[PDB]
From Swiss-Prot, chains B, D:
It comes from Vibrio cholerae serotype O1 (strain ATCC 39315 / El Tor Inaba N16961). Belongs to the RNA polymerase beta chain family. Signal peptide: none annotated. DNA-dependent RNA polymerase catalyzes the transcription of DNA into RNA using the four ribonucleoside triphosphates as substrates. This is DNA-directed RNA polymerase subunit beta.
Length: 102, 101, 102, 101
């Protein structure tokens, strides 16, 4: 009766800025379409303050993080997590009425 | 990646109590698990009073209503309709990770 | 714990082609991004066969149809209906864990 | 326009029965409404047998597991995880019509 097709997916976790400084980024440090540190760059003090200036409290993390395929990072808070799924939800009213009738 | 297993379904619509009184119900007149008048029975002034006392301004309407299998009624306002789907949304994190890669 | 933001919505209903011929379209007759008859045009035999050639068994109808704000049309099957909602579903894992903990 | 009222939630993960035997459970070992071993109890060879006989290859894991409040265990495979959200999806047809206009 209801099909749910995933078009995109993103995981976000709370930044711990005090642990990010000096890391070499293994994935782009980004939020809301803006990349603050490119993969392979070492995070500078300015990068930290640029995130802060923009009010970036959550950053993107690879979705694979949630199935254990990314070694855990001290610069995100493990007690947090926001999963955003963009989907096309197809609801058959006919099929629902048939569930209801039965 | 995401399955949506439907366990129950209903519409809800705003009630126009003036137009209900005197009619014979074609579906249970119901809200929040309480049935006020059963299908096949006449709606009394007492029923109308009970609905008002309980503050019932929306009632359940079968999803069949939306595909014409239950015919239209004056005492529910189609402009106000809601579809409530009770479901288990089964999200495969493995599948989402696969999609991300 | 879960927010569901609607980005787009479409209603589709099964076409009854035998009742569409000769109608003056009051909304574009379309499916899958292709407009077959523009609003205000009278539907010709060719339009019917063009829909058929493309296998168009369902057409778009204004969503308002489902709240009774479009007078019913004999050229769609009233016993049908497919509602497609494009949404951003935001799932707070933290909030869900808190529901679970409680 | 759409509210998603959560009524229950769990993860599920693939079980590695060899790594469970002998451990003391920190959450009920459970599938499809049957609890095999309660939180705080040791998993026996008999428990392992029961799981196998019932064909239980995925078990429930608390959502707390995903935010670190329940610590990681060798006997569930995080690569396989699912999140199952039981909810009432309340779709306002009035609101969808409003959005369409």
């Amino acid at each position: 009766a209801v099909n749910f097709e995933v078009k995109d997916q993103t995981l976000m976790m709370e930044l711990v800025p005090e642990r990010l400084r000096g890391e070499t980024a293994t994935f782009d440090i980004e939020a809301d379409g803006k990349v603050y540190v490119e993969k392979g760059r070492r995070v500078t003090a300015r990068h930290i303050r640029q995130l802060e200036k923009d009010g970036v409290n959550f950053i993107e993390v690879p979705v694979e993080y949630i199935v254990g395929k990314v070694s855990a990072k001290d610069y995100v808070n493990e007690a947090t997590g926001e999963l955003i799924i963009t989907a096309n939800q197809e609801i058959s009213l006919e099929a629902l009425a048939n569930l209801s009738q039965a």
